[model samples]
Target: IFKPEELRQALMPTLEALYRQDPESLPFRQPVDPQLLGIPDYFDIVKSPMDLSTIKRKLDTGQYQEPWQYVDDIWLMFNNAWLYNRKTSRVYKYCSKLSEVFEQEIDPVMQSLGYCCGRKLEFSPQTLCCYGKQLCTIPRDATYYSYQNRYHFCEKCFNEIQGESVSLGQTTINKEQFSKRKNDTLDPELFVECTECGRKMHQICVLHHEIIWPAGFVCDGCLKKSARTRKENKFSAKRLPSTRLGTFLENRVNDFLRRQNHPESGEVTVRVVHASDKTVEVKPGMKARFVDSGEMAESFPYRTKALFAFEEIDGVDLCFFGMHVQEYGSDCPPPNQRRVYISYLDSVHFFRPKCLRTAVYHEILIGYLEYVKKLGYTTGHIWACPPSEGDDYIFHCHPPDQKIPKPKRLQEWFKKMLDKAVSERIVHDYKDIFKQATEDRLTSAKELPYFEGDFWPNVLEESIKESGGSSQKLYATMEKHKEVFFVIRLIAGPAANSLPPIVDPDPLIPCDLMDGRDAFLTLARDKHLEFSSLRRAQWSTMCMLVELHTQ
Candidate 1:
């Protein structure tokens, strides 16, 4: 919204260049250049002021303002503004003098008449979690219906109905047959109970029940109250109340079922139910029961037994790592030594990635693979040292961009300087990251004004359209990447502890060059192989996996 004269002044440089240059200086130059400068080419290239009659006639009404939003049936919102200008045939004006009509008349009308471009600016997060998953919400008021015979029930009222089992003889039968049909029919009463207190209740009442655990959950209040009443008058009056072993056994059963599933399988479900006696017997495993409070048993409640089953095996033993005959003994191994893993690439170090905001592991793997591809390397597999001897192994890798390997003389000199054994020189601003981009950042801008002379879009469009285009290629481009796969998480914070120099965290990948083909291939492989996060603990697990396969 600069003042008209101020805009003229701002646009003067570009206007002069386009005006004074010979028509033959650039191919495809329009006859009467609109001289539009400093603004995008959304406005039609109409010569100043005089072209209004044609524009108004086409619209057929004064109410119809301009033709900027939609042109030739292409939707403006979805149109690529950059590409249209390159291939479009339209005249433009560039001059030190522009009529008041051009400045004050046409621009504003064209802008207002455009599609709802402002609304397209999105505020929603562009993330995987938000993309395809169902949005779960419940109504404020709903009736209850029996669900799976569990204490908890589904809400009714604003509900979808399902086919219910019918009584056979009730349709066309005598009184005796009808009576028999009634006996055969299953009632809601036989299926449901109050979820909170576990009292047999009508299914319809469950929706109105003041307290019900929809997930067949035990009421926390009841457990707390019961635990409190039992330990009265003792120094630690916080003991389980009333030898009601029901609650304790319920908790034990819940824990056991959750753990019984295969560790790597990641499948588990649990339920807790109270059994008979002041001594609650947990079903399926009846032997396991809650011990009475120490006060009642004349022993400390903490010393109770049969509470829950405990597995004594170590976790490292769960995964296989080659362990076989070794001629060397423990005495031969170095004392107080531990294995350390390292990364080989770093996106933030020497070359910050284009979207460093992506997930740390994704950025790491993507950056590393791109780097290696640039170096003409073909890395298909990556592995970190595996765990052994029940000791956790830690690994670290440095980006290839940083720590340029020094020759022996320079290396010795550097070490000597560090040890204060030699004089050295320091340059304050040798290679600052904030410095302006060199020619390296931009190619020939004059070759294509819209693209800023970069080749990324063509690569992407071609990748998506090619008959033999890979599913990998679709995601390799920035345009199709989000549609194919979305970012799950991103974590990037400065490392306080020094990392051992290597490459990126994705060990097999490398980055020290830029090759788009390799970069695309590397990125595809990253999406395929690197699905996990690389946060501290997760990175530790990754390193363990690498080691297991490498050794």
Candidate 2:
């Protein structure tokens, strides 16, 4: 620690040698420009940003304590690349190669000096929640969507099938299911006015943060101001465990478990029992099934009991049997009557290198729909909220401005899938099954009973004000974009139903989907594997595997 001179000698040569190496340095050489890169949310996502240029400057600026100190920043640089870039992208490849050569040079020299290494090529838990990205970004908090039969997807892909026969969980099939009612509907994706400050944010944040309760919500600031309270804040929603967010998935999962068992208001409560982890014997092929034990079945939520087949895999348990079966609910009435909700699909989908997909999710999706149908569920519903710009993995991997707009609206989602719905025979009713939410029920306060007395009126006034007093733009946004409503009637029913041959004419109602976001860094991977050809090659082999392992 005393001899800065000796440490400097050991460090400078190795660091200099490492940087001059592959100079395939675009993002690596200089600090990242969120503006030039066109990733607007980059700063929000990457807090402790690092790059080679910054590292070099810091070293020159006498900001060094040990050889391993700068080494930590190098890890940060590569890990940031891994976090933001999908593994399939060129940036990831550059980072991967550079990581290796850097590791090689540093490991030997650093070992010779007997210095312990810093974080060598590890991923942090700060990843996204909803987008189509499948990186294990959040440890206990990433959620996803699954179809009824056997297809599971991130929120982006899940909604990608929206606007067509793929209901995006819609229910209004033939005209207005509700009469010219004096009220409206609420979704996690929509706005809810705060009673305390009269300031407004949408419901997704409230739902995500657990700010809303049956008794309604009051903000942190409001509580503080009213520290002159009736009963020490008398709050229903709990305080935050950490200042940073884990993207709705973590708290959401915990809340789902609580609802299943405790159920603020009672229904048939779901009960879960634990099975010892992986006690099941090793089998050659990987598989997933409903554990179907008494406890497992009882704990199973609306979609949990539904059966779906597993593709025999290279050997891993995605979840040996069922893992977490979550259903979104509220405190007011009985939230579970054996129906599934697609709000925040929270299953920690870990990456497996070469696994068969499509079938399990596709089959299980159909399975759950049928299971719920028979379990006394009748109609399907959706108020389509187009996923955000950051909702797809492509957001992180590709340049944002160079991107031509892809469809995120339900109307667009509808148009793409429309022609296919005709051929699929899944439609029980036609275009009449849809409506503009602002056209009727969304007119007054009763619709949002969970908020303040002035909540609805304030939301309406503020929302209209936001459009500069123009109802057209306001209606266009709230009605068309935010709350494009649909209800589907399943005429043929689930059994008479096979997978909608084309759920949305062009959308891949993919049973198994593969993206190379997951990285098993320590294990040497197959050099020849490319995900694009793998996706293309799998379908031909998909049929072969299904028939061969038709269990």
Candidate 3:
């Protein structure tokens, strides 16, 4: 506390010296305005002592106090005290002020009064994740959760650290690379030049060249130079198709089913209940069932308006895609059946323009047709809703005697399409999975305050309301509490109007340490005894007779 008399005695000489000095004749060329020298708005006068302890004691009694006010007052005091020091500047004042408060106030409160287990952990008000001696509050909007602990990080450090991290992982390149890969746009110098032919080729292409077997990597000219070459009559080039045809089947199935389930099919309808690159489920309406009896076997995991069955051939069921085609048999009898029928209603209803031109559907059908031919069927049949005169007839299939141009090799085309489709589906599925995981992570907030038994819940509710329902602000208030106590919650009677209770009990017990503790303990004892007693005691009216309680 400041001594009133001592303060006056010390100020008397300075006041006299200032009083005698002529304002106009001051040492500097320009005289300061008298109005600018008055006290600042933040200065406090009512709590006269002007010492730290007295001010803190009185300030703590208030229901609310802004910590920033203390920060300002401390900075002002430091500025005034260090006015004569040549090195003390505004930056120095700011940088040292918080540290001084931590050294004098925060450390004392944390060491003597703070509790960690029952109480929640929190970021120090001084700053978040303090970097060395410089405290900083990383912006909340830019911060992200850390997997290591409950701590969060700003964008800068989050990128720098290489830890076991999880995130939304939202990016375009997350899909399979095969679909994205293409021939490199490299210069001739960058490519490998065939030693004998002097033709440039990509590194990957060079590695896969046909002449690189048996002897070594040699140009085609040099490979053909060998004398061991042999030729046979009626020779035909061998076509080695890739085995990865799953993707082509997947895309074609998705496309065909999607079109078949189109809403415009007024007759026999189909409805796509589920669709992915690899699988599609089409619900068969009554008309659809009439067109193909195989729909009875079309049992998929999802509900739909249609169903279909896979066809069995030579004791083995055809693959799902092939099976659907076989089920759409030609109009001929069972012995010579080779035609496949697609309902006109299904074709018009589910027709998707993009898939029509893509080789996915064509490749799938041709491949299936080839399979039928291998099974000893002499003809392959296809039926569709014939297009208008102006329609692109080349892309459409004619009924039974369709003169479709048989591609030299349908297997190879089908294999490439399948690879692309599988790549796309994997990417789609992973994106859905990642989206769900990211949302779960974002919804959870670290250090979420929890209230439990005792008076804590009531205190929390009151504090939360007082802080305008902000849990963050409420945490700040609790951290400022010097003394610890119990907390509890209670509900008022039904008839209450936010005031006088319907069942008005006795005057409330004062919650001070001395009285409230004894009152609570007494209540606890009474309740414990009230529940545990086995029998009730009866009193006698006369002093002469003593009555004993009977069980």
Candidate 4:
């Protein structure tokens, strides 16, 4: 807070021009000259005379405790002239001109006062993320979540949750659609809403080049808007914040399902069962056995833990995305090597969806490892395999004998996503999974303020309001409570594997993957025809239908 005298001295300059001015050339320069102008009755008509010349006399005398007092006098001067002079007189016209000038002058001033500058201040991120934890940066790199209305996703996460390609791929687009698209210019895939400004474009109008990628998803309208932001300079760059870990994982996976447009994706419950220190006791929450890690066979005692994203087509549960036990040869201390296996990362789809497969694979590479890291595991050994027909249980069906030829698409998906993660600095390389993450890196006020939920913005404004509507106070207050702000530290692993100064690894609580894994598997395996006969029939029929059509 400035001393009162300092404030008065500061306000003096803007008022100086009113005190000294050219007479006759400018109206309202001095008090109306009653005798000289031949209006001898002016004093009688306007008793308490006010003008630009007289205002500084009071201004110089330190009469104004606030700028508003001086402003009030300016108004008094105008009204006095307005009342005394007829609209026909030249002075009335001059007074009218000055009135408009002041109005325009004061408007920017009213909006820009220290209080005015503060009136423009915002306490929290206006751009919010739907994933409750992390905040979105890069306005163009975001989209609204249909699930969490106000919630949106940042560039990296949303990519896989439909992780939209600028345009739908060749397989997904059709010839009949092309006929409609011939005249299309301004529609999205059925039309896309803007991530930057919530505007949209349509599907048919979207061409091979005219779409937005996940990292930058501004539609045609918002693309121009993204280039213009008045939300300027209030924040600097910092590492983003972490969301509540468990809910973060759960919602993200579910978001991916919905974005990929799965029919029963809503029914499959995804839970973040374990992350380093936070573990959920195997709960009796879900009703059915949801996954089978499938005896793809990891070494003994190194069991695979499956996440519960079930696909029950034809009344049998099909497992996808196998979560694995962090591999270690012996009874190990926590940090002997923060290593874990993520295997069989695929989902059961309704059709020949190569695009959806890309999302599922990319999601595990991008989404699941962060969960694994927060679970405090270091090395991510991806068992990137599709579940096979030869296995006792089938979560998804591949060709009868060919199984998704080992490491072809999976390797490319991991590589492609790594290129993205690398470009984003989320990962160093494949060897260095999410590593060396500590949340404190983002604790500086030079960066934007982000919190766990939507409510933080209001709390921030309340604090700003409490600080006498001062952002500086709000800024300093923000600086002091850096710890209260929650954010996940980005993981940057070592360049290559090396033994560490020993630290206990985070206790990995394998989630409810066992009984459910066995039950889902045995039920399908023992009654193969009963459970999968309908599924096989469709598979064979589609095979022949496409074959005949091609022929």
Candidate 5:
């Protein structure tokens, strides 16, 4: 763009002055020709410096009156300057070192003199700031948990430029408060301290990270340490006691017991009877206490409940409770009789000990049965079943010491009687006969009929005939008012069983029928009535079957 001679004359004094001022400004001292400075023959326009050495030398000569005129142009020149030096020296590392030097020396000068600027001011959505012009101050003991970490601020002008006056949000001497808090040291100090690695951070920082400090306390550094420790002892570490888990479950149990409503009556008083025989009646507090261990003769109300948590044996835990009710029934009848039923509810862990776990069950049952007996109830029934099957075993513990029979054989006999009556078309006397066997009548005549339901008609007839028709004389009476009966059948005879030893083998007594007089009268009247038929074909038998088919 210019005459080479005129450009060379203008640039000569600048190169002369650069050689005089810094002396190390250029690698060589020469009257560098302006035509040669136009663009180096070896320079690649994309990667090499573009006449930057010539421009820098001219600026350094102070030929330009305003220093700011050159400030804005210095950055690109210096940025490309390192590239040129890198290629010329054949050293790759020189580029980075030169870039650092440019940033330290030239970049700062350009920045301070308004020749260059930093990243343009952008709105910070989190801080509500732009170019640090808008201001906000964090409190000394700020509610750390309520705020975010990236938006936090401090006393110094860490963002650089200090030209404009800031509108501070609140009036507080934050500097003094921060300085004072940093030095305060106490055992249960307000500030958090890591227990493991012993690193101390700001209390606000502690809260900001959501830490439950000072109790097995740990910081970020300590967390890493403990995490490593955890990995080291991962498989071998002992389990910590479940204090919270235990407390929570116990509270839940207490809540359930306290809130449970019984239809008959509610718990009016929590009676505490001491070892000294002194009776103390108190209100239900946080926990309800009945009897802990040993024996205490206390009668629980009907429909009222008590909870029992069995201690874990062989890694199996059981929770059991009992509800007292007046009368419970089955499909078979004894129909709305007044007898206390001990409704026992129990659950055991998945893993437990073998070899007759029913000992614990029986202990609870006997204790509960005795309690029911003292309350003036005649008989108590437990609707128990095995884990996988239902109603396979039945036992009657009246005197509380009898090893009752496995009642499947007895149940089979009852089932056979019902089947026989259905097959024989003999339905009228069947209900009475079965009631006489089991002493429990067919209550639901619709759902379970006379020929159906819990019955053993044919067995009752045979047993009665064997005993010569005397029914009430069979059972042993407890206190004369309470008659005890057990319809038990043993598999390996009476000698090989392990329940409370059977003393008096016979305990089942036939129940008196409602229409006993009528039954006797019918038997007497129908004693001579018999039908004899000579069948010429199958038609007579068919006719008799048709006569029995009444819808």
Candidate 6:
């Protein structure tokens, strides 16, 4: 809106003052290296590829919102203030150099442009506010492990104890009964086998049928039978809602997964062992229990009821997809269930995505690489990329000229990685993947068919739905039993093929960057992180968390 004279009037006084001040004579001069102290350098400092120059332009052209315009105006004011106090604020050498440059090179042009005076002064979001070197904090030979009762860890390996979930849920343990339970060869961590019946119902499931069922320990079939003899004495395997337990476990696993970064897949398998009849056929419309009343000395005063009868465990009525619990024979299952599965839900996990994004994929790989390096393993890989890619893109762990040495100590590291990855990914049956899933069954479930509920919909889901009206109305019912779901996915190994060995390139420069190529190459050569086996370790942690919280 201004005429040419308006600009001239504003500029003339500033021009005369500049000549009198002879601002060019200021001693705040330093030879600037474009790489270290330039606009392009700021971009290198930030983690994200956010383009600051484009942001500044967007602010200037008024294409952005008021906040950005305010930012632009403050930028101008800061430059002006720096120029004004160029001599007085010579606290640091770089500070003085900046003042001189702005005063001489930028101030006059801005004055000629008829800029106003009231703009707010501020720092740019992209400004390099701090620069420093990282101090090493970890000590050599440091030992860290979690023990079960104390630190919750293993004694020999120093790894965290894997059965914390079962331990946390127990208040009292019957050493006499648990001795028998363990003797039956059940996987004590997840499932407890009966000493008498060879039945493999969930340990807690049998407790309710006994007199004074120890809250934390499993019962042999003879013990469960003895519980039936003494009316007053019993084990209260009284399950607190299976769905609530499921959901609670889910949250614990999810938190661990998010912290570790996305795995090859985000799915895990959780086997649910309900007290069901081993000989009875469990079909679509088969009722799980029958109520018998009075006089046989086996009857209750009121109606006989099993904890979760008629509720589906792995099918519809036993849906395990997501939020929407489908009726039997319906189209889709719930997200929570689909994400993780108990027994019978194994077939559904095969179709999920197999690889995580590159950013997270590399992060996990680096963790494992560091692990191997610390173990004195020289086995590694090099990842090459296009001219404009990152250093790892052209990774070289071993020298190009070295002989392709026969495999030596690499097998242990490789096996560990494969085991971890397979364990996490093959959630259904270890027998199917590694041939090691639990094969426990409940012997006493046949004694009372009337009290059992379909594990398909499970105890909690049916209780909430049957308590009356919509699932929403059963909030109180749902609250009584808190369960969640967790998804942990992994790609099956041999991951040896995921990365290829790097080869040398033309132009005599080994890396991609021009000015910083040497430093980049050096850093790449000595990088502490390895890309191999990273995802597997992260996923392994996710599995452990599931086991921890399930109890």
Full-model lDDT for every candidate? 0.23, 0.37, 0.27, 0.40, 0.29, 0.27
User: Ten-residue segment with the worst summed lDDT in candidate 1?
Assistant: 320-329
What is candidate 4's lDDT per residue for 266-313, written digit by digit as tens? 333343233322111111111011112221111123323434333334
The lDDT ranking, best first, is 4, 2, 5, 3, 6, 1
Q: How do the predictions measure up, each by TM-score? A: 0.16, 0.29, 0.16, 0.30, 0.20, 0.13
Model 5 per-residue lDDT tens digits across residues 1-551: 22344334543443344334332444323333435766454345334333346555555555444332343233344445443454456322443443344344443433333222221111111112222234443333322211122233343432243543332344332222222111112122123445654433333223312211214545555556547422121111011122222233334333433554323221111110000111112112101222222122122222222223323222212122212223221211322122333222332321123222333333333333333333333344322222121110111001112223344543343344334433533211222223333444323212111111112223333434555532333222111212222221111123222333212111222212111123212332232110111110111112212221210
- The TM-score measured for candidate 5 stands at 0.20
Better of 3 and 5 by lDDT: 5
lDDT of 1 by residue, 364-470 (tens): 23322233223222211111222222112111222222233223433343233222211111111111111111211422211111111123324433443463422
Number of colliding residue pairs in model 3: 20
lDDT of 2 by residue, 48-155 (tens): 899987887777666776665677788788878877887699888888888877777776666555322222421112223332344422223234443432233453
Pick out the ten consecutive residues of candidate 6 with the lowest summed lDDT.
322-331
| Sliding window of 10 residues with minimal summed lDDT for model 4 | 282-291
The positional error of residue 227 in candidate 3, measured at the CA in angstroms, is 6.2
Clash counts per candidate, in order, are 37, 37, 20, 27, 3, 88
lDDT against true structure, model 1:
0.23
Task: Please give the lDDT score for candidate 6.
Answer: 0.27
